[PDB]
């Protein structure tokens, strides 16, 4: 993956865990939107975030977001048993002759 | 209701060939871009190829560059990916993904049709 | 004297594609070796003249058609190519002699929150004649009903903004096009 992530951040219910996503200047530092995706095991990925609070229609509002320098976050406060899936960051990389969406390394989230 | 569904993935001998299609419904196909992206089992998502609405921008990952040709049909509501000369690492479930005029990194997804080579 | 290939490329602002500029370049030495030998221009492929022989020719009239367009919609700046820009905003002649160039301009033409300045003719009652520009404001009539009034159903304003947000992908990113035309 052209982005980077910690391998697995997870915690107990009732807690907040910050799932970072740090990358280069072309992908995060050039202002492109950072999206977070929920991939259940055996299921196609389903998006749940964009930038700072741009959730889609039909998700619980625990998943907030932020941006900081060349990084981002998926602070999820007070987890439940439904929040058991792999999580992937995203950006867009417009370096010359590449022009690609970039995905993260993959963070597993358990309770 | 955005509908991306694929068809064509199956077990092929290594060095063989395939063509995964991707049907589209619920949106203007000619407007947004289109991505082909896979997930090997026990692995994260690796971007594979991208095409845009006029198909004037076609891009490939370095691992598959010169190996694949992503082809789209702006009127048939269909997106194809010509699979040729498969190496070991292409054992993956291949997802079909579309960008959007809002962010063009926002992606919808397909249910994924598996490709396995051995 | 070195004629201005600097305020048709390094301009502060290019106008839209519905009302594109026409800067006649004449009475100079036109050095295209400074213009081809640069990595910025993504779409300096061209028609009628081989690009390496531009500095070996003398032309009668040289134009420079400054505008800025969407990233996908730059294959439509081509002779014989048909599309939406190519039909309604900027049509090259089929016997075009000249060299169109283009480069990406997210640093310049795409401010945060958007840049709604650049608009394009979505509708017109007829296809363009080549090298014709139409700065009009009449409401386009689409349906059977001749409204000729406020923008109702089947009654559209012909222009619409590009919406050059900085997050947008290279399909929608602002590409800055200069279309040179010769004898």
Residue numbers in the entry:
A (entry chain L): 21 to 131
B (entry chain H): 20 to 137
C (entry chain R): 334 to 516
Task: Quote the authors verbatim.
Owing to multiple mutations to the spike protein, including in the receptor-binding domain (RBD) and N-terminal domain, Omicron BA.1 infection can result in substantial NAb evasion. The Omicron variants that have emerged more recently contain similar RBD sequences to BA.2, with the addition of L452 and F486 substitutions—L452Q in BA.2.12.1, L452M in BA.2.13 and L452R/F486V in BA.4 and BA.5—and exhibit a transmission advantage over BA. We expressed and purified the prefusion-stabilized trimeric ectodomains of BA.1, BA.2, BA.3, BA.2.12.1, BA.2.13 and BA.4/BA.5 spike (S-trimer). We determined the cryo-electron microscopy (cryo-EM) structures of these S-trimers at overall resolutions of 3.1–3.5 Å.
